Amino acid sequence: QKSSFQTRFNVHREVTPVELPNCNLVKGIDNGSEDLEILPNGLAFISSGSGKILLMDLNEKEPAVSELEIIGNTLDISSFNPQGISTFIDDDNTVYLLVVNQPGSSSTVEVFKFQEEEKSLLHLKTIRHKLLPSVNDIVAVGPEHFYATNDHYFIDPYLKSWEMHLGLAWSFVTYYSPNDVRVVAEGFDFANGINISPDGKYVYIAELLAHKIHVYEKHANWTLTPLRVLSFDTLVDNISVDPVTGDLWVGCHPNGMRIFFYDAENPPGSEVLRIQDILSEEPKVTVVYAENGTVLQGSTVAAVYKGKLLIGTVFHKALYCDL
Ligand SMILES: [Br-]
Ligand SMILES: [Br-]
Ligand SMILES: [Br-]
Ligand SMILES: [Ca+2]
Ligand SMILES: [Ca+2]
């Protein structure tokens, strides 16, 4: 029990550095960049839990961030508190952005339409459901269709907290669509990152406190069946997938004590993994970037675009590096 706490929170871990050539802090990101997603054309959305969605054009040489204006009357901005995000590009090239929201005491998924010329997000729909009690991240598979991780079974934060420390592992994953919402996987100890292979045939789920990434075959009827489970010596948080290769790019918290019981004199470090050939017998895992937090603290996500690496954090900055 003190033993399972030590292993779940990886309380002994320290970080061997892995450096990258030319890394710059992104000016204007100082209060979190928890999740991000990069479109094929190099525009990157970043959420920051005011809650905001930020935009970077990664085709520029030193991209600057701008704050996207949210418009519409279906959303209260004043309680907007974004967590994970996901995009869906329709047949006509309409870009939808799905954003997990934690407005006060509950959980929603907000659906926006991205209006490129205006640099704006038009709110379309607030989704909520009983099978979405505690949403951490989603992967979109249509404008209003996604898989969602619930990082807890309970809604009440006092109960979440007991639920986590008791080690219940009741977190679960929900398939959500206008006609049909169901649990597709369950029994996780803090499910969180989630993503999908470019051909739509596999779904990847990060189980934070177990230090695992689960690979599920995804079927024509939207059901998932377990295929493989990879384990790591780090708390895996968000998963990004490179659409050209299918590689996973994963933001990780080496030592979970530092990220869950925050201490400015012992702040969390950062770590990015690349996973290739995830279906093969020895998937290739590489630490691409790793540090103890003297530059970037609490890395949650990383993705790559034409030789650059962008890395976001729970409550700190963001880092842009050459690979
Ligand atoms: Br509850
Ligand atoms: Br750390
Ligand atoms: Br370091
Ligand atoms: Ca996401
Ligand atoms: Ca997270």
PDB file of all heavy atoms in Angstrom, residues 133 153-157 159-160, ligand 1:
ATOM      1  N   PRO A 133     -18.416  11.369 -16.935  1.00  0.00           N
ATOM      2  CA  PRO A 133     -18.398  12.124 -15.677  1.00  0.00           C
ATOM      3  C   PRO A 133     -17.190  12.985 -15.447  1.00  0.00           C
ATOM      4  O   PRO A 133     -17.252  13.988 -14.650  1.00  0.00           O
ATOM      5  CB  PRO A 133     -18.333  11.015 -14.625  1.00  0.00           C
ATOM      6  CG  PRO A 133     -17.569   9.814 -15.366  1.00  0.00           C
ATOM      7  CD  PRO A 133     -18.356   9.894 -16.714  1.00  0.00           C
ATOM      8  N   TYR A 153     -13.983   7.771 -12.103  1.00  0.00           N
ATOM      9  CA  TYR A 153     -15.420   7.372 -12.070  1.00  0.00           C
ATOM     10  C   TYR A 153     -16.331   8.488 -11.458  1.00  0.00           C
ATOM     11  O   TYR A 153     -17.379   8.867 -12.037  1.00  0.00           O
ATOM     12  CB  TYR A 153     -15.539   6.053 -11.291  1.00  0.00           C
ATOM     13  CG  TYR A 153     -16.927   5.530 -11.242  1.00  0.00           C
ATOM     14  CD1 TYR A 153     -17.385   4.635 -12.226  1.00  0.00           C
ATOM     15  CD2 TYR A 153     -17.821   5.984 -10.250  1.00  0.00           C
ATOM     16  CE1 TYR A 153     -18.681   4.140 -12.176  1.00  0.00           C
ATOM     17  CE2 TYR A 153     -19.083   5.515 -10.187  1.00  0.00           C
ATOM     18  CZ  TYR A 153     -19.524   4.603 -11.137  1.00  0.00           C
ATOM     19  OH  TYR A 153     -20.819   4.190 -11.047  1.00  0.00           O
ATOM     20  N   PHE A 154     -15.902   9.096 -10.359  1.00  0.00           N
ATOM     21  CA  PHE A 154     -16.732  10.123  -9.708  1.00  0.00           C
ATOM     22  C   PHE A 154     -16.652  11.538 -10.285  1.00  0.00           C
ATOM     23  O   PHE A 154     -15.645  11.924 -10.948  1.00  0.00           O
ATOM     24  CB  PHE A 154     -16.407  10.139  -8.235  1.00  0.00           C
ATOM     25  CG  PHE A 154     -16.830   8.844  -7.527  1.00  0.00           C
ATOM     26  CD1 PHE A 154     -15.874   7.976  -6.964  1.00  0.00           C
ATOM     27  CD2 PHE A 154     -18.214   8.520  -7.431  1.00  0.00           C
ATOM     28  CE1 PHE A 154     -16.288   6.774  -6.289  1.00  0.00           C
ATOM     29  CE2 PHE A 154     -18.638   7.364  -6.808  1.00  0.00           C
ATOM     30  CZ  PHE A 154     -17.670   6.460  -6.214  1.00  0.00           C
ATOM     31  N   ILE A 155     -17.693  12.322 -10.001  1.00  0.00           N
ATOM     32  CA  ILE A 155     -17.760  13.719 -10.397  1.00  0.00           C
ATOM     33  C   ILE A 155     -17.279  14.599  -9.250  1.00  0.00           C
ATOM     34  O   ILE A 155     -16.487  15.513  -9.452  1.00  0.00           O
ATOM     35  CB  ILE A 155     -19.164  14.132 -10.838  1.00  0.00           C
ATOM     36  CG1 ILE A 155     -19.614  13.297 -12.064  1.00  0.00           C
ATOM     37  CG2 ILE A 155     -19.227  15.640 -11.157  1.00  0.00           C
ATOM     38  CD1 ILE A 155     -21.172  13.356 -12.339  1.00  0.00           C
ATOM     39  N   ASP A 156     -17.745  14.326  -8.049  1.00  0.00           N
ATOM     40  CA  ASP A 156     -17.400  15.120  -6.877  1.00  0.00           C
ATOM     41  C   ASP A 156     -15.888  15.054  -6.587  1.00  0.00           C
ATOM     42  O   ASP A 156     -15.328  13.946  -6.388  1.00  0.00           O
ATOM     43  CB  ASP A 156     -18.181  14.613  -5.652  1.00  0.00           C
ATOM     44  CG  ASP A 156     -18.021  15.506  -4.427  1.00  0.00           C
ATOM     45  OD1 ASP A 156     -16.994  15.450  -3.756  1.00  0.00           O
ATOM     46  OD2 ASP A 156     -18.953  16.282  -4.136  1.00  0.00           O
ATOM     47  N   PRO A 157     -15.236  16.240  -6.495  1.00  0.00           N
ATOM     48  CA  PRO A 157     -13.768  16.219  -6.398  1.00  0.00           C
ATOM     49  C   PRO A 157     -13.285  15.610  -5.093  1.00  0.00           C
ATOM     50  O   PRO A 157     -12.194  15.041  -5.021  1.00  0.00           O
ATOM     51  CB  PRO A 157     -13.381  17.692  -6.530  1.00  0.00           C
ATOM     52  CG  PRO A 157     -14.716  18.471  -6.237  1.00  0.00           C
ATOM     53  CD  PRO A 157     -15.796  17.599  -6.730  1.00  0.00           C
ATOM     54  N   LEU A 159     -14.627  12.953  -3.704  1.00  0.00           N
ATOM     55  CA  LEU A 159     -14.758  11.499  -3.983  1.00  0.00           C
ATOM     56  C   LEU A 159     -13.653  11.062  -4.985  1.00  0.00           C
ATOM     57  O   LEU A 159     -12.996  10.002  -4.829  1.00  0.00           O
ATOM     58  CB  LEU A 159     -16.196  11.266  -4.562  1.00  0.00           C
ATOM     59  CG  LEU A 159     -17.374  10.752  -3.699  1.00  0.00           C
ATOM     60  CD1 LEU A 159     -17.170  10.946  -2.205  1.00  0.00           C
ATOM     61  CD2 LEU A 159     -18.791  11.164  -4.191  1.00  0.00           C
ATOM     62  N   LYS A 160     -13.415  11.892  -6.003  1.00  0.00           N
ATOM     63  CA  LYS A 160     -12.258  11.665  -6.987  1.00  0.00           C
ATOM     64  C   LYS A 160     -11.016  11.463  -6.226  1.00  0.00           C
ATOM     65  O   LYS A 160     -10.247  10.518  -6.441  1.00  0.00           O
ATOM     66  CB  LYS A 160     -12.058  12.847  -7.906  1.00  0.00           C
ATOM     67  CG  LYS A 160     -13.088  12.960  -8.964  1.00  0.00           C
ATOM     68  CD  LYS A 160     -12.634  14.193  -9.862  1.00  0.00           C
ATOM     69  CE  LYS A 160     -13.667  14.269 -10.900  1.00  0.00           C
ATOM     70  NZ  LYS A 160     -13.395  15.182 -11.955  1.00  0.00           N
TER      71      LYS A 160
HETATM   72 BR    BR B   1     -20.117  12.007  -7.842  1.00  0.00          BR
END
